[PDB]
Structure 1
Amino acid sequence: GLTRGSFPEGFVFGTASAAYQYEGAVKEDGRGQTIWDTFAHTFGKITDFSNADVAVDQYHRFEEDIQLMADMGMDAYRFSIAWSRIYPNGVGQVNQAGIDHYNKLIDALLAKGIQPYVTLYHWDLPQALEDKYKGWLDRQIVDDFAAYAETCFREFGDRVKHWITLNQPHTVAIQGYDAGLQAPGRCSVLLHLYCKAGNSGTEPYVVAHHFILAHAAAASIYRTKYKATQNGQLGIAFDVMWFEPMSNTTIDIEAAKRAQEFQLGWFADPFFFGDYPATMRARVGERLPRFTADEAAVVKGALDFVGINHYTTYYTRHNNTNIIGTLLNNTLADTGTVSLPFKNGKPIGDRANSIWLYIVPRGMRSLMNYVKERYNSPPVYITENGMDDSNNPFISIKDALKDSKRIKYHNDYLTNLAASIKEDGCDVRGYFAWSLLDNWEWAAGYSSRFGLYFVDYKDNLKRYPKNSVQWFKALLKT
C-alpha cells in the first residue's frame, strides 16, 4: 500500500504537539502564568478535574521524544513556543531562559535530522495580557503578538524555516468566546450559565478580526526584516471540518458551502481576497468588523502556505431561526445552518473516542479540492490529523497499544490525501499526525489518548509504542 513513493518527492512527514499540552514545568525557569493555567485551575472547566502542570513533561524529556521520532523516520516536528516563557508578562523583559530552552529543543531536533515547524501561538496567552486588556478582545494584542513573533524570528529564524503564526483561530473565537468551553471561557451568560462574562454574538467576531490583524502584523515584520536573509515561510493552521450537504438539494448544497465560508472563509477569504465572505457580511452585519483599506492591503497575501488541521466531516442542512434578537445572538445561528454527523438516522461513519470525531476519510480529499479551487492552489500542509483512544483504566497497557483503528484512520486519510495530490493536482507539501504522545487534551484532560505513543500516567510518564508506531516506521522507510 502506502509508501513515501505514494507522495511527491520531498513530501514532509511529521508529528505535532503544543506547549501547554506537552511541556509541564509550568513554573520553571521564569515562565509566566497563561490563560490555560488559570482555566485548568478553575472549578468546572476540565472534565476530569486535571491540569497540565506536569503534562507529559516534554520540557525535561524532549531528547527522549526526539529519539522516538527518529525511530519512526519522521522528517519534521511541529511544536509550539509558549509565549509566556519568552515574555512572562506578554511584553517587557525577555526571559533569557525561555530563549535558551527553545534553542536547545531546535538544536536537538536538527541534530537528529528532524526539521522544526514552529507554532507561535497555540492558545496559551500570557495571563498578564488577559488581565491588562482582555487579551484577544483588544486591538493592543496585534502589536504585542507582532513584537513577540519578531523576537522569535530574530532568535530562532536562522534555523527555523517554517512558521505557523496561529493555531486554529476559529476554534479559539468559538470555543473561547461563544461556547465558553475553552480559555478564557467567555460567552453570553443567557446562553450558557457557566460563563462569568461575555457576549456570544459579538466577541467571537472581534477576536477573529484581531487574530487576522495579528497574523498580518507579524507577517509584515517577517517579510520586511527577516525573510530575505532567513529564506523561510509563514502560514496559519486553520481548523477545518469538511461539510457535505444533508441532502443533494440546492438549499442544502448552499448551506454546506455557507457553513464552510463561516468556518474556513472567515479567515482565509481575508488572506486571499482582502475581505470576509459576502455571506458573513450579509448575515452578521454590524457585528462583523470592517478592514480599512490599509489593513486589507497588509492582510491580503499574508500567507505563504495554508496549514489545514482536519479530522472529520459532518452533514449540513439549511436552518431558519428568528431568535431574540440581540440577547441570544451566536455564531451558529449566524451561519443559518445546522451541522451534525447524522443523516436519516445513520452516523456518517465510525467514531473515535472524542464525541465529535467521526471517521470520514473522503472528506480529506474533498477539502483539498475545495482549498485548491477557492484559493487558486496555495501550498497546503496538513498541520494536524489523527484520532484518539479512550483512557481506559480497566484494560492492560498491552491491550491499550493495539490501536488498529488509528492505523486504519491514518491509512485511509493518507490514501485520500495521496489521491488529492496525484489525481486531483492539489499542492500538498506535508502531513503532521496528531499526536506524537498521548497528552493533555484541553477540557477533556487526560481522558483522550491521541498519541502514536502511549503515556503511562501511573508510572512516571513512561512512553510505550502503540502498534501505529511500527506502521509509520514501515511507511517512512527508505
Structure 2
Amino acid sequence: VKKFPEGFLWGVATASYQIEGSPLADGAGMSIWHTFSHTPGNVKNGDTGDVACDHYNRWKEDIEIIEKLGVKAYRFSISWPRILPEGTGRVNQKGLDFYNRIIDTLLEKGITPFVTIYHWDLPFALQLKGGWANREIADWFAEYSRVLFENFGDRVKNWITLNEPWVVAIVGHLYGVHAPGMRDIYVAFRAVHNLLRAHARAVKVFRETVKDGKIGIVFNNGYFEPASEKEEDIRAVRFMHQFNNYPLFLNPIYRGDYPELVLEFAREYLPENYKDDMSEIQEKIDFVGLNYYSGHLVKFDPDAAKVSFVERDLPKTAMGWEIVPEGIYWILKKVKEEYNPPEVYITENGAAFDDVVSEDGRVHDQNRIDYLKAHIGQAWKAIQEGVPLKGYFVWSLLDNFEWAEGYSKRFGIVYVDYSTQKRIVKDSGYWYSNVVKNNGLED
C-alpha cells in the first residue's frame, strides 16, 4: 500500500477551449485558437473548438460527475476573451456569469477550484497587437488577472497564472504548430520573456487583491536521458532540461536570470536589456505546478537546436509518447534539488489511448489505469524522499479537443461520444475514484 499525506489533493483538470464549445456565445471575443483552428491545414481533420464537449451548456452535469467520482479538486481555465472580448477594456458580464455559476457550484459541493488564468486561448484582438510578442501584454495580462481576482477571489483561493509558457512561446511562435502559428526565433524568445513579465505582474496584483490566496505557475516537463556517455550527449540532455523544462522559467523567478545553456543558445534572440526586468520577475510565488507525460532519449546532432531524439522500443501511448513513469519521480526530485519550491503540484498527468465503447456500454481502458498507477506510485516515492508534493491532477476529466490533433486523441477518465454528447465514465474513472477513497494505491 502507498498512502499519501492526509491533506493530499486529488484532482482532475480541463481547459476552456478544449471543453467548452460556443466560443462566440454571449458576447465573447474570438480567441487565437478559434482563428488558428478555422485556418485550413492547422488542425487534424479540420477540427475546431466550436462545439467540443459542449461544457458551455453541460457544465452542471459535468460537475455532478466530479462529485460522483468523489474528486475534491478541479483545475479548470478561464477564457480571457469571454471575460474581455477585446482583451482589454470592455468586461463582458455574461462571461463573468458563466464562471460564477461554476465557482459557486464547486464550492457548494466542497470541490476546491484551482483556476488557470491562461491556458492558451489569447483574445484574437490582442494577437492583432502582437500578442505575447508585445511588451504591453504585461499590462494587458495584469488587467485581466485583476478582473478575475476582484470578481472571483472571494471564493477561489488557488490560482495559476500561465499553463506551460514554454509551449505558448516556442510551440506557438517558433515551431508554428500551435496558435498563433508563427516561426520566428526572435519573436519566440520575446514571448518567453513577456510571459515571465506578465506572470510577475499578475502575482504582484494578486498580493493586493487576494490576501488570503496562493498563486503559482505551471510548466511542461519531459524526462531526458542521454543516448550515450559522450560528453556531447550529456550536454544535450542538460540543454533540453534547462530549455524545455521548468528551469527556463524558474531560474529567472528564483535566481534572476535565464539558465546557463539557455543564455549560451539564445542570448542573441532575447531583448537587449532583458536583465532590466529580472528584478520584477523575481516576485515571490506560493507553489510550482509541474505537468509530466513522457521521456525521451536524446543525442547531440549538429544537423538538428543541435539535439535529436532517439526512438526507443518502449511502450507508447496513442500520441506516440514513450511511457517512462520514473521521469515523474526524477522531475520532482530535481525541482527540489534545484529550486526548493515550498509547495509543488503535479498539475497534469495522463495518457491518450484508443478507447472504444464495448457492447456492455463500458469503456475498458486498463492501459490508462496502468499508466496512471505507475506515475502515482512514482509521485509517492518522491514524497517519501522529501519532495513537498501537495496534490496530483489527472489530465483530463473529459475526452476533449487535443489542440492540433483535434478530437482524435482521448485523454479523459470520462469518455465523450461527440455525436450525442453522452458521458461514459471509463474504467480509469472508477479506478481513480477508488484511489481518492483510499488516499493512494492499495495494490
Q: TM-score range by the shorter chain?
A: over 0.9
Q: CA deviation at 1:294?
A: 5.4
Aligned to 1:205: 189
Please provide the CA RMSD for this pair.
1.7
Give the TM-score, by structure 2 length: 0.95
Q: Quick one: percent identity of the two aligned structures? A: 42
1:251 partnered with 2:235: no
The verdict on how the C-alpha distance between 1:94 and 1:210 changes in structure 2, with shifts beyond 3 A counting, is same
Aligned to 2:363: 401
Q: CA deviation at 1:427?
A: 0.8
Matches within 5 A, 1:69-218: 69-131=66-128, 133-187=129-183, 199=184, 201-218=185-202
Q: 1:369 aligns with which of 323, 333, 350?
A: 333
Residues in 1 aligned to 2:264 and 2:275: alpha-carbon distance in whole angstroms:
20
Q: CA deviation at 1:291?
A: 5.6
The verdict on how the C-alpha distance between 1:397 and 1:448 changes in structure 2, with shifts beyond 3 A counting, is farther
Residues in 2 aligned to 1:18 and 1:245: alpha-carbon distance in whole angstroms:
33
1:477 partnered with 2:441: no
Q: CA deviation at 1:301?
A: 4.2
Q: Deviations over 1:447-475 (max 9, x none)?
A: 011000111112x2100011011111111
Give the TM-score, by structure 1 length: 0.88
Q: Which amino acid aligns with 2:234?
A: I
The verdict on how the C-alpha distance between 1:215 and 1:135 changes in structure 2, with shifts beyond 3 A counting, is same
Aligned to 1:195: none
Alpha-carbon contact 2:80-2:87 (below 8 Å) kept: yes
Q: Identify unmatched segments of 5+ residues in structure 2.
A: 439-443
Q: CA deviation at 1:377?
A: 4.0
Q: CA deviation at 1:232?
A: 0.9
Matches within 5 A, 1:203-352: 203-223=187-207, 225-228=208-211, 231-264=212-245, 265-289=247-271, 295-321=277-303, 333=305, 336-340=306-310, 342=311, 346-347=312-313, 349-352=314-317
The verdict on how the C-alpha distance between 1:398 and 1:454 changes in structure 2, with shifts beyond 3 A counting, is farther
The verdict on how the C-alpha distance between 1:17 and 1:398 changes in structure 2, with shifts beyond 3 A counting, is farther
Residues in 2 aligned to 1:249 and 1:209: alpha-carbon distance in whole angstroms:
33
- Say how many residue pairs are matched: 437
Alpha-carbon contact 1:381-1:431 (below 8 Å) kept: yes
Aligned to 1:381: 345
Task: Answer with 397-406 or 306-315: which moved more.
Answer: 397-406
Q: Which amino acid aligns with 2:291?
A: N
Q: Deviations over 1:370-401 (max 9, x none)?
A: 10001124411100000012366xx7475871
Q: Deviations over 1:283-315 (max 9, x none)?
A: 223212356565212211432111111101111
Residues in 2 aligned to 1:63 and 1:149: alpha-carbon distance in whole angstroms:
25
Q: Identify unmatched segments of 5+ residues in structure 1.
A: 188-198, 322-331
SS at match of 2:23: coil
Q: Which amino acid aligns with 1:473?
A: S
Q: CA deviation at 1:120?
A: 0.6
1:7 partnered with 2:12: no
The verdict on how the C-alpha distance between 1:9 and 1:164 changes in structure 2, with shifts beyond 3 A counting, is same
Alpha-carbon contact 2:329-2:381 (below 8 Å) kept: yes
Alpha-carbon contact 2:328-2:379 (below 8 Å) kept: yes
Residues in 1 aligned to 2:39 and 2:142: alpha-carbon distance in whole angstroms:
30
Q: Which amino acid aligns with 2:315?
A: D
The verdict on how the C-alpha distance between 1:358 and 1:450 changes in structure 2, with shifts beyond 3 A counting, is same
Alpha-carbon contact 1:146-1:218 (below 8 Å) kept: yes
Alpha-carbon contact 1:377-1:426 (below 8 Å) kept: no
Alpha-carbon contact 1:56-1:439 (below 8 Å) kept: yes
Alpha-carbon contact 1:36-1:124 (below 8 Å) kept: yes
Q: CA deviation at 1:220?
A: 1.1
The verdict on how the C-alpha distance between 1:246 and 1:301 changes in structure 2, with shifts beyond 3 A counting, is farther
Q: Which amino acid aligns with 1:56?
A: C
SS at match of 1:311: strand
Alpha-carbon contact 2:83-2:91 (below 8 Å) kept: yes
The verdict on how the C-alpha distance between 1:140 and 1:397 changes in structure 2, with shifts beyond 3 A counting, is farther
Alpha-carbon contact 1:46-1:445 (below 8 Å) kept: yes
1:55 partnered with 2:52: yes
Alpha-carbon contact 1:220-1:298 (below 8 Å) kept: no
Q: CA deviation at 1:337?
A: 2.4
